[PDB]
Amino acid sequence: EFVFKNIDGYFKIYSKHTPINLVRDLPQGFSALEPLVDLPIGINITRFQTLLALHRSYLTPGDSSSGWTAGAAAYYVGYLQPRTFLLKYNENGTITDA
Amino acid sequence: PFGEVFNATRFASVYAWNRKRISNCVADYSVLYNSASFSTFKCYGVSPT
Amino acid sequence: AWNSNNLDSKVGGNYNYLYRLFRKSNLKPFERDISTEIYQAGSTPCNGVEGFNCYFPLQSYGFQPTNGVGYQPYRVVVLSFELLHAPATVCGPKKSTNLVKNKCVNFNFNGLTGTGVLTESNKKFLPFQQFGRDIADTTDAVRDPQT
Amino acid sequence: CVNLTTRTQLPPAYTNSFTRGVYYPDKVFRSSVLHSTQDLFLPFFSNVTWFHAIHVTKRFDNPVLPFNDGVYF
Amino acid sequence: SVLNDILSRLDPPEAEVQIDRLITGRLQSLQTYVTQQLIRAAEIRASAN
Numbered sequence: 001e002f003v004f005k006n007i008d009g010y011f012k013i014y015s016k017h018t019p020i021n022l023v024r025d026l027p028q029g030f031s032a033l034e035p036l037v038d039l040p041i042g043i044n045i046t047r048f049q050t051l052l053a054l055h056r057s058y059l060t061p062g063d064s065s066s067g068w069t070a071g072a073a074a075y076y077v078g079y080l081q082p083r084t085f086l087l088k089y090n091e092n093g094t095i096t097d098a
Numbered sequence: 099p100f101g102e103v104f105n106a107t108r109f110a111s112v113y114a115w116n117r118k119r120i121s122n123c124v125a126d127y128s129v130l131y132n133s134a135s136f137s138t139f140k141c142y143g144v145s146p147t
Numbered sequence: 148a149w150n151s152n153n154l155d156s157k158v159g160g161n162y163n164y165l166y167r168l169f170r171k172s173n174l175k176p177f178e179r180d181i182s183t184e185i186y187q188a189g190s191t192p193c194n195g196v197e198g199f200n201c202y203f204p205l206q207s208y209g210f211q212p213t214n215g216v217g218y219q220p221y222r223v224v225v226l227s228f229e230l231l232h233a234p235a236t237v238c239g240p241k242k243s244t245n246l247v248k249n250k251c252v253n254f255n256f257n258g259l260t261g262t263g264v265l266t267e268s269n270k271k272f273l274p275f276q277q278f279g280r281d282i283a284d285t286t287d288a289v290r291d292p293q294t
Numbered sequence: 295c296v297n298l299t300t301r302t303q304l305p306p307a308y309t310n311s312f313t314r315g316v317y318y319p320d321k322v323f324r325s326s327v328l329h330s331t332q333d334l335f336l337p338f339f340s341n342v343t344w345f346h347a348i349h350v351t352k353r354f355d356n357p358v359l360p361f362n363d364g365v366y367f
Numbered sequence: 368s369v370l371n372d373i374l375s376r377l378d379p380p381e382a383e384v385q386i387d388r389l390i391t392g393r394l395q396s397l398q399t400y401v402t403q404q405l406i407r408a409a410e411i412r413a414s415a416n
């Protein structure tokens with residue numbers, strides 16, 4: 001999971017690796033993203049795109065227009081709007097629930 | 099490098115002003131305050147000294 | 148601000164410095180309009196015709212050696228900074244000192260100043276975090292950057 | 295630029311993502327305190343547009359997507 | 368909000384004004400507490416009687 005955000009001349013990102021097992025939909029539960037990087041940038045960006053890995057093999061035709069067997073992949077995009085969250089903080093400090 | 103920004107061959111005009119982001123370094127403001135070769139050094143929310 | 152009359156005086160003259168005359172709406176704070184177009188007012192749209200009541204975006208200057216001091220060019224630099232958001236590396240000139248523990252003493256950490264005892268803290272901090280706070284939103288813990 | 299052929303056009307699949315991607319709003323650490331911060335968040339039970347990059351026939355799609363403040367991927 | 372921070376970054380005359388503002392704001396806060404406390408104290412006093 002990642003949350004890309006642009007605020008006050010800073011580009012920011014947040015991440016978590018979850019070892020969820022066998023759920024097609026996003027897992028029921030609570031996990032909290034931890035900021036990974038902060039970059040100070042002025043770029044204004046209207047839209048974004050994703051990068052795929054083409055799984056090129058011997059069985060494929062052998063060209064850049066038709067030669068590919070990419071297979072399975074899945075990704076979900078959700079927008080972010082200003083909202084107020086009451087965030088519970090645990091003794092350690094992990095946000096256990098919100 | 100506050101000095102390099104202060105002395106430059108070309109300064110961008112008001113329509114497309116030049117902006118530089120300075121960070122990850124140590125700047126001494128005494129020379130700027132100390133030098134006093136500048137006509138106006140107005141300061142808001144920060145004491146120059 | 149500070150004058151550079153000598154640099155702005157040329158025999159040929161200088162006119163690469165321009166300021167906008169007209170714009171439909173007010174420019175936003177800390178933003179620059181990079182768009183190149185001629186301001187248009189109401190009817191009789193110019194579409195680049197730039198005759199009467201339609202004006203080109205650019206406007207030059209008049210800096211000349213002969214020209215008076217009062218309207219002579221000034222070189223202006225604006226310094227803007229925001230503080231107490233993240234660990235700050237824009238720190239000034241000062242040196243530093245060895246940490247002191249279990250004794251009431253004044254302390255400053257990366258431009259943060261607090262009047263209390265400093266002791267080794269049991270609380271475990273995750274990599275991103277740089278400050279700790281209590282219920283009353285007062286400083287409770289800090290990390291010496293060097294240490 | 296190089297292209298790709300035989301793509302399948304279908305309406306976007308939808309799912310409901312609930313209480314996901316809550317991100318530590320800032321740098322402070324607090325213990326056993328409930329805090330309210332007015333920081334952009336994915337709305338709970340917000341609608342989520344699923345996407346597919348799987349051939350399973352002749353299916354491959356990775357087109358441009360609109361971006362607002364909430365670019366949660 | 369922090370009192371020390373205000374004093375550290377402001378010259379005395381300006382610092383004077385901001386200090387006063389804080390005190391007025393802080394004086395009012397204290398007044399409310401003491402005034403509130405008295406009413407509660409009186410209420411508790413009645414119960415004790």
Ligand SMILES: *[C@@H]1O[C@H](CO)[C@@H](O[C@@H]2O[C@H](CO)[C@@H](O)[C@H](O)[C@H]2NC(C)=O)[C@H](O)[C@H]1NC(C)=O
Nearest residue numbers: 099100101102103104105106129132133134135
């Ligand atoms: C930019 O201009 C400033 C101001 O003239 C220069 O600062 C002076 O540099 C000389 C030579 O190093 C010193 O002897 C002076 O004490 C400095 N102050 C002044 C007011 O002259 C600076 O060297 C120039 N160049 C930069 C920063 O690149």
Ligand SMILES: *[C@@H]1O[C@H](CO)[C@@H](O)[C@H](O)[C@H]1NC(C)=O
Nearest residue numbers: 042043044045046175178179
């Ligand atoms: C950002 O880019 C969009 C492109 O549609 C443009 O309309 C808008 O004016 C730009 N805003 C800024 C602040 O650059």
Ligand SMILES: *[C@@H]1O[C@H](CO)[C@@H](O)[C@H](O)[C@H]1NC(C)=O
Nearest residue numbers: 090091092093094095271273
């Ligand atoms: C939280 O702290 C307790 C201390 O008993 C520890 O057992 C537990 O592993 C910690 N969990 C996390 C997520 O830090």
Ligand SMILES: *[C@@H]1O[C@H](CO)[C@@H](O)[C@H](O)[C@H]1NC(C)=O
Nearest residue numbers: 307308309310339340341342
């Ligand atoms: C999500 O989109 C689907 C489209 O089928 C719609 O039925 C549903 O009402 C939407 N829910 C929300 C919360 O937008």
